[PDB]
């Protein structure tokens, strides 16, 4: 049968995931049947259809009443409760919860879904503590069907890790530094306003905003050989979507820029097809809206110094690309439901 | 002696007001002694000093500890209680509260400060219900010193009303339409997210966002002769500050653009001095950052058709110019304290 899915948090990732599944509903083992959000079904159906980044949804029709959102004649039941312990996961027969509120990233908070009736939960963010982290194309085969709470890492980890895995198995990554020139996200203020992070407090569309990130160290979670060997920061810039990763790695086997591109191109055509895209085109950020790959290598920017210092640059649609991986991971868990 | 002031809500208007008073303190009858806000004093001192719009504060030193913000050695006590009934206004000897949270604009809401010990409340927004509304330079001299809760209207009303009063007394305004091409505010969303207003739900730095406004109707509160004869809309655009009012009026006395400009110019030099500024310069929005006037008429944009259809265009720094008027009204209340 089909695994029944509930979305907790109908935000950028929650609605991107929904539109990702709608376009792949014909070939899917998942059935989205429930939504919990702080907003009502009519508001959320309006935002699902009219999206400033994705545009007006064209595939199927979207409507709503007091209780449901309707997408292509398929009814999606809705509820509004901030406490997951109160959600009707038992009554709705919910199998897998997509945790996309960004609030229940620990086993403590995420288990409240399980207490409510849900059987598994997929966290669309890095986890807090003992939560297994998975990046499709890197380690998602190591998923154990008995794990009840899992994390799909961050969008940056999903862009960096496939590149890192390829470079590591060809040249041996000893250390590595990362900087993601990142589009601003919903955790930043529109104008200078209160925030526990003094940089996220500043007007997002007016500034280059540095913030810390564990996305580079979280690569050690999915490539355990490199635990403690990668670090980095983030620079949020006034673009609404699509980001780019700048990775400078210290390498064992000496190489040159041409060979680094050949290796990643080779991987993108074979073992990493669908995860890494190799591009020799001179494109910009807008051209990667809606790209399904986790990493798009900008081959023109590759450079090596002294054989051991490698710099590679990779694009990623932090909203749509990551949401495609959330769907891929959920589809993988449905195939290994046990 | 001095009138002791507390600021409720240390946001854009609350902090702009604080800077206005810090620059004008030498000739002030008010003393800002306390701040209530969501944030701790350290976060608020950082945001007071570093402003994406107003730049680093120059006039005074600004530090903080866990208890106070120090604006030039002057200790400003800080508290963080979102229920104003619990605020220590009695203990701090508060006379006047600058209500700048945006959520206590009804009399029932604003009176919570009076229960806490405050004597008067100045709402930095339109009041909900029967709350005396004032626009400095238009009707503020009708202030009754026995009123305990007053409203300084909105920033758009403060720009439109002085221009309207001059045009009405010169030509007789019969009807009037307004559109404020407005900088986005913190009420909007950085990226597409839920909101009671489906248009404000959309990414502010990405869109032209139409929204309703009562600023044109509110002119009837301060100019009673024009009650019901004005209406308008608002278009939020991707600028962080400075807005512009477009006003098309149907007038009784036929006129021409040269006379419309001459009447506003003369009023700006006499009765409306410091409130209306007259400019024949070819400037853009950034040039009016930090302007102290409530309305800067763009004289070369004045148009008249058929003698009786008049079009005038007026700039205003919706954050700084309005905050100067909040300070102006507060000093007026201190001058007539009873």
């Amino acid at each position: 049968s089909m695994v029944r899915v509930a979305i907790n948090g109908f935000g950028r990732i929650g609605r991107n995931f929904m539109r990702c599944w709608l376009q792949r509903k014909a070939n899917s083992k998942l059935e989205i049947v429930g939504i919990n959000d702080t907003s009502d079904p009519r508001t959320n159906a309006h935002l699902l259809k009219y999206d400033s980044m994705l545009g007006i949804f064209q595939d199927a029709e979207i409507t709503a009443d007091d209780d449901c959102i309707y997408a292509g004649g398929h009814a999606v039941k809705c509820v509004s409760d901030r406490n997951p312990e109160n959600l009707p996961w038992s009554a709705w027969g919910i199998d897998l919860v997509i945790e996309a509120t960004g609030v229940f990233t620990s086993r403590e908070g995420a288990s409240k879904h399980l207490s409510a009736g849900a059987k598994k939960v997929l966290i669309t963010a890095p986890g807090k503590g003992n939560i297994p982290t998975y990046v499709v194309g890197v380690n998602h085969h190591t998923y154990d069907p008995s794990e009840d709470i899992v994390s799909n890492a961050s969008c940056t980890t999903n862009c960096l890790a496939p590149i890192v895995k390829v470079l590591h198995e060809a040249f041996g990554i000893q250390q590595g530094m990362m900087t993601t020139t990142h589009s601003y996200t919903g955790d930043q203020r529109l104008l200078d306003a209160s925030h526990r992070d003094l940089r996220r407090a500043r007007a997002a569309a007016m500034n280059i905003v540095p913030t810390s990130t564990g996305a580079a160290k979280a690569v050690g979670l999915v490539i355990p050989e490199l635990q403690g060997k990668l670090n980095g920061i983030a620079l949020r810039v006034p673009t609404p979507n699509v980001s780019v990763v700048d990775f400078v790695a210290q390498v064992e086997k000496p190489t040159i820029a041409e060979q680094v591109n050949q290796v990643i191109k080779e991987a993108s055509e074979t073992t990493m097809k669908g995860i890494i895209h190799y591009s020799e085109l001179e494109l910009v950020s807008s051209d990667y809206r809606g790209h399904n790959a986790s990493s798009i290598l900008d081959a023109s920017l590759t450079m090596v110094l002294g054989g051991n210092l490698v710099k590679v640059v990779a694009w990623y649609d932090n909203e749509w690309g990551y949401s495609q991986r959330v769907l891929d991971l959920a589809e993988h868990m449905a195939a290994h439901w046990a | 002696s001095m009138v002791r002031v507390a600021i409720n809500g240390f946001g854009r208007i609350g902090r702009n007001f604080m800077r206005c008073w810090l620059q004008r303190k030498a000739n002030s009858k008010l003393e800002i002694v306390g701040i209530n806000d969501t944030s701790d004093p350290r976060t608020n001192a950082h945001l007071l000093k570093y402003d994406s719009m107003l730049g680093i504060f120059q006039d005074a030193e600004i530090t903080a500890d866990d208890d106070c913000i120090y604006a030039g050695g002057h200790a400003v006590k800080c508290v963080s209680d979102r229920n104003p009934e619990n605020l220590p206004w009695s203990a701090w000897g508060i006379d006047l509260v600058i209500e700048a949270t945006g959520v206590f604009t009804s009399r029932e809401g604003a009176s919570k400060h009076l229960s806490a010990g405050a004597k008067k409340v100045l709402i930095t927004a339109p009041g909900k219900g029967n709350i005396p509304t004032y626009v400095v330079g238009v009707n503020h001299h009708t202030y009754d010193p026995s009123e305990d809760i007053v409203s300084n209207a909105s920033c758009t009303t403060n720009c439109l009303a002085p221009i309207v009063k001059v045009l009405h007394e010169a030509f007789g305004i019969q009807q009037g339409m307004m559109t404020t091409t407005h900088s986005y505010t913190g009420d909007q969303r950085l990226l597409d997210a839920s909101h009671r207003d489906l248009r404000r739900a959309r990414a502010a730095a990405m869109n032209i966002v139409p929204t309703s406004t009562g600023a044109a109707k509110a002119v009837g509160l301060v100019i009673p002769e024009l009650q019901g004869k004005l209406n308008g809309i608002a278009l939020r655009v991707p600028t962080p500050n400075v807005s512009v009012v477009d006003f098309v009026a149907q007038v009784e006395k036929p006129t021409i653009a040269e006379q419309v400009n001459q009447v506003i110019k003369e009023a700006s030099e006499t009765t409306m001095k410091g409130i209306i500024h007259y400019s024949e310069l070819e400037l853009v929005s950034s040039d009016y950052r930090g302007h102290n006037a409530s309305s800067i008429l763009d004289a070369s944009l004045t148009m008249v058709l058929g003698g009786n259809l008049v079009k005038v265009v007026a700039w205003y720094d919706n954050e700084w110019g309005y905050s100067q008027r909040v300070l102006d009204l507060a000093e007026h209340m201190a001058a007539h304290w009873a």
Binding site: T101, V103, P126, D187, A193, H195, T213, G214, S243 | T38
Partner: peptide
Amino acid sequence: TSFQQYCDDNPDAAECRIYDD
């Protein structure tokens, strides 16, 4: 602080969101 406990009671509020991306 009272500000820190506010983000404990409202982790999804605009003053409290930290997206690690």
